Amino acid sequence: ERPTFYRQELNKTIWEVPERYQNLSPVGSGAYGSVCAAFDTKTGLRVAVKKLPFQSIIHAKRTYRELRLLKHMKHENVIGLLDVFTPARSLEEFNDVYLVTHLMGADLNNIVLTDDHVQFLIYQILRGLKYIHSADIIHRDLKPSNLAVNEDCELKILDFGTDDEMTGYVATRWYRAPEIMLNWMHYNQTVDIWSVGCIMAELLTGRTLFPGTDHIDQLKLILRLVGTPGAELLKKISSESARNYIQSLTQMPKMNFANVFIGANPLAVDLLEKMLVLDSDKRITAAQALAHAYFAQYHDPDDEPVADPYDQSFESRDLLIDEWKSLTYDEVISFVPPP
Numbered sequence: 342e343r344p345t346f347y348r349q350e351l352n353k354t355i356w357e358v359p360e361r362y363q364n365l366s367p368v369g370s371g372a373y374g375s376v377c378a379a380f381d382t383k384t385g386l387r388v389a390v391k392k393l394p395f396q397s398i399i400h401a402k403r404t405y406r407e408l409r410l411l412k413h414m415k416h417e418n419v420i421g422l423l424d425v426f427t428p429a430r431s432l433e434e435f436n437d438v439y440l441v442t443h444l445m446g447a448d449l450n451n452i453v454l455t456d457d458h459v460q461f462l463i464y465q466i467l468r469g470l471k472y473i474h475s476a477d478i479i480h481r482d483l484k485p486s487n488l489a490v491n492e493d494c495e496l497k498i499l500d501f502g503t504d505d506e507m508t509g510y511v512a513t514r515w516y517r518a519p520e521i522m523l524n525w526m527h528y529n530q531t532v533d534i535w536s537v538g539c540i541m542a543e544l545l546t547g548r549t550l551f552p553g554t555d556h557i558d559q560l561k562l563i564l565r566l567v568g569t570p571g572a573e574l575l576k577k578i579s580s581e582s583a584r585n586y587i588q589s590l591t592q593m594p595k596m597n598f599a600n601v602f603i604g605a606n607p608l609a610v611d612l613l614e615k616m617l618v619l620d621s622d623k624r625i626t627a628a629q630a631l632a633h634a635y636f637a638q639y640h641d642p643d644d645e646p647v648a649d650p651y652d653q654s655f656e657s658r659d660l661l662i663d664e665w666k667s668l669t670y671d672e673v674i675s676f677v678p679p680p
């Protein structure tokens with residue numbers, strides 16, 4: 342049965358939410374979008390409520406995409422959907438989408454740690470990533486700011502699935518795999534593993550691994566550590582222009598990671614060497630990384646679940662605004678809360 346909704350001005354828009362949600366207060370000061378913290382009186386959970394959506398074909402498809410992704414994700418280490426609602430009573434008046442998830446304590450930026458803490462945090466990221474990758478979903482933009490923890494350091498991944506904000510000395514680009522940063526090729530799931538390597542290094546040292554002042558400076562930072570590409574990788578760079586530029590660079594050998602990560606657990610150094618490989622074909626996978634000796638005290642093959650199949654055929658589909666809107670409406674209406 343349809344709950345009673347009440348109205349409140351918050352982020353200079355009128356939020357209309359079910360009575361169960363109380364004490365709504367804006368969080369993140371814009372950083373997360375139009376998001377409010379609230380208390381869910383039905384479940385006793387502190388929740389984050391995001392108000393989004395059908396302004397164009399691209400916007401409507403992106404709205405559908407986000408709802409589909411969030412509805413699929415059912416894993417301890419991945420942000421999932423506690424609720425989704427609209428005050429609209431029919432498809433015709435449907436124009437707002439509200440998404441509800443767990444309210445976390447802080448992101449990984451507001452944390453950066455002992456080796457034991459690093460083990461635990463990276464384990465959880467990899468556990469969540471195994472799940473996400475098993476559904477053929479790539480995050481594409483893993484960074485400390487979309488990794489959040491509660492008070493008990495229990496972690497969840499957020500934001501899975503412009504040129505200006507990627508320009509210059511910016512954290513938005515520091516965690517990106519070189520093949521995606523420079524559009525070398527059609528990339529794979531281990532772009533996310535590169536990101537984990539960058540994050541893990543930063544947890545260990547307290548410092549950004551590749552704090553490039555721009556794309557090129559960052560590539561140079563990367564290649565100084567991992568070496569310039571060999572013949573085999575160059576061949577895989579389908580971008581003739583990008584391949585051409587790479588060959589202009591003075592060749593450099595891979596550095597000794599033990600001399601870069603001075604005093605770190607040798608098993609951590611080993612894992613970093615396996616994650617921070619230039620050739621994405623040869624990077625360690627999430628499933629493989631979980632079985633690495635570094636996570637011996639946390640690893641449990643019976644407690645690292647995979648995802649149900651995820652149908653993303655809609656991605657190659659071209660539809661009208663009202664069609665994406667109708668699809669989105671169906672998904673809102675059919676939502677079943679978690680047990």
Ligand SMILES: Cc1ccccc1-c1n[nH]c2nc(Oc3ccc(F)cc3F)ncc12
Nearest residue numbers: 373389391440441442443444445446447489
């Ligand atoms: C990342 C963080 C840092 C500090 C405090 C709270 C949070 C936080 N907890 N939950 C959060 N959810 C979001 O986005 C949503 C994602 C999916 C939703 F269904 C609803 C959302 F609001 N953004 C920040 C936080």
